[PDB]
Design a protein around this ligand. Structure first.
Ligand SMILES: *Cc1cccc(C(=O)N(C)CCS*)c1
Ligand SMILES: *Cc1cccc(C(=O)N(C)CCS*)c1
Ligand SMILES: [Cl-]
Ligand SMILES: [Cl-]
Ligand SMILES: [Mg+2]
Ligand SMILES: [Mg+2]
Ligand SMILES: [Mg+2]
Ligand SMILES: [Mg+2]
Ligand SMILES: [Mg+2]
Ligand SMILES: [Mg+2]
Ligand SMILES: [Mg+2]
Ligand SMILES: [Mg+2]
Lengths: 8, 236, 236, 8
């Protein structure tokens, strides 16, 4: 479960 | 450089084709050529720039993590000496990743940020600057690590200050910026409580402003709010 | 070239690391360097060579098909003229794909095939030769198309003749060769009945020989037999 | 449902 960052 | 002879509009058209074909290195090269024409980017063009480079650096970061894990295992007690190859290849991928980050940071500095006067565009570019310094920080191990980390922090902080003054709490750029700055706090700056506080405050302030939105804006904002919630669930 | 200064064993080690990191362009460059050392390849090294280039050309072929579909739609009645960009970008991807095929074919001709005396290695390389001519045929539209198609056919046919004489009907190289030659017949040579006959005969002859195999060999052979069955189900 | 070819 990898943390989320903002993917355009 | 190599894109200097191609029309700006043709570079944008080809960037969109490259995206459809999942050719992200080509997409990034086209969008670099478009930026180097010297004109400001539209909202859609900024999005294409970010997609292209995020996909390129994403493949490099994932590869770097695989190689770094293998290298760390090789340095455990009981592991056989296999020579310099793992370190060399990790360094090769690392140098390529740093080069892509330097390329993006160079486009932002020459001259995207200085010409960006509208809050949305300025925040978008400052978020990108924080992101690419953050990717440099992920691999930094030497004497400039603290300055690399502070460069990411400073760019994110300026973006946060502008976004709080000039954009609603549900704005997707503001929300994505807060998501990324929270990740910066959690895993780069060793500040998990700041990461959690920022994610929670951002989520709650967006929640309170959803009532002002159209159905389409609501869908856009709630999508990013769910990413904040995903991180809060992982971290608490 | 660029890999001339690296040890053969280091190139192989780095090819395996590149595979783990899903860096297939690097993997192919390492394996090209290993081939160019001039020594014959082992079974495992042949597999690494094939993995590397198949993944590289696979991304190019998928991208080419996306772009070719867009180009074909652009030439339908009622479609707006959008300029030369779609054709130009499809041509760019096509030229890169052809270059990779020419690189693989060059390694096979200088000098992998001529030094391969064991049936398994010779069939493996001749199958590769047929595959990369087949990928050239997928994009060929001009006066050499027939000769490109015949070069694929000829390489596959020599591989089939050797494999029938020298290898059991369950051998995975023999089975994968038959799978690919059947695809060649179906979609390159306009011979669907030959494709179906070859897939069916190959499947049935492998079935009859499964009783001779260990559990591990049985798993290997039945996996490829299922691919033949998948095609028969699609085609009938 | 794309037809299968041999992936090493
Ligand atoms: C900050 C930013 C940049 C580009 C796109 C977005 C966005 O709206 N989404 C949905 C990406 C995930 S944050 C945001
Ligand atoms: C012909 C060939 C080449 C490399 C690997 C194989 C193989 O055994 N498998 C499972 C790939 C699918 S045919 C076969
Ligand atoms: Cl290396
Ligand atoms: Cl082009
Ligand atoms: Mg012009
Ligand atoms: Mg070694
Ligand atoms: Mg301006
Ligand atoms: Mg405003
Ligand atoms: Mg040597
Ligand atoms: Mg045009
Ligand atoms: Mg020999
Ligand atoms: Mg034999």
């Amino acid at each position: 479960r990898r943390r989320k960052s903002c993917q355009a | 450089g190599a894109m200097g002879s191609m029309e700006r509009a043709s570079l944008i058209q080809k960037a969109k084709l490259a995206e459809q074909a999942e050719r992200y290195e080509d997409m990034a090269a086209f969008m670099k050529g478009a930026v180097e024409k010297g004109e400001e980017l539209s909202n859609e063009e900024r999005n294409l720039l970010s997609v292209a480079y995020k996909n390129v650096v994403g493949g490099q970061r994932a590869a770097w993590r695989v190689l770094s894990s293998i290298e760390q295992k090789s340095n455990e007690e009981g592991s056989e000496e296999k020579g310099p190859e793992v370190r060399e290849y990790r360094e090769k991928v690392e140098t390529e990743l740093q080069g892509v980050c330097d390329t993006v940071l160079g486009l932002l500095d020459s001259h995207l940020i200085k010409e960006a006067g509208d809050a949305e565009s300025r925040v978008f570019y400052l978020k990108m600057k924080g992101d690419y310094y953050r990717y440099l920080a992920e691999v930094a191990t030497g004497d400039d690590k603290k300055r690399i980390i502070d460069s990411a922090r400073s760019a994110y902080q300026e973006a946060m200050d502008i976004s709080k003054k000039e954009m609603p709490p549900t704005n997707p750029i503001r929300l994505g910026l807060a998501l990324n700055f929270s990740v910066f706090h959690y895993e780069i700056a060793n500040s998990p409580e700041e990461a959690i506080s920022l994610a929670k405050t951002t989520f709650d302030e967006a929640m309170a402003d959803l009532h002002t939105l159209s159905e389409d804006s609501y869908k856009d904002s709630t999508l990013i709010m769910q990413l904040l919630r995903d991180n809060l669930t992982l971290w608490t």
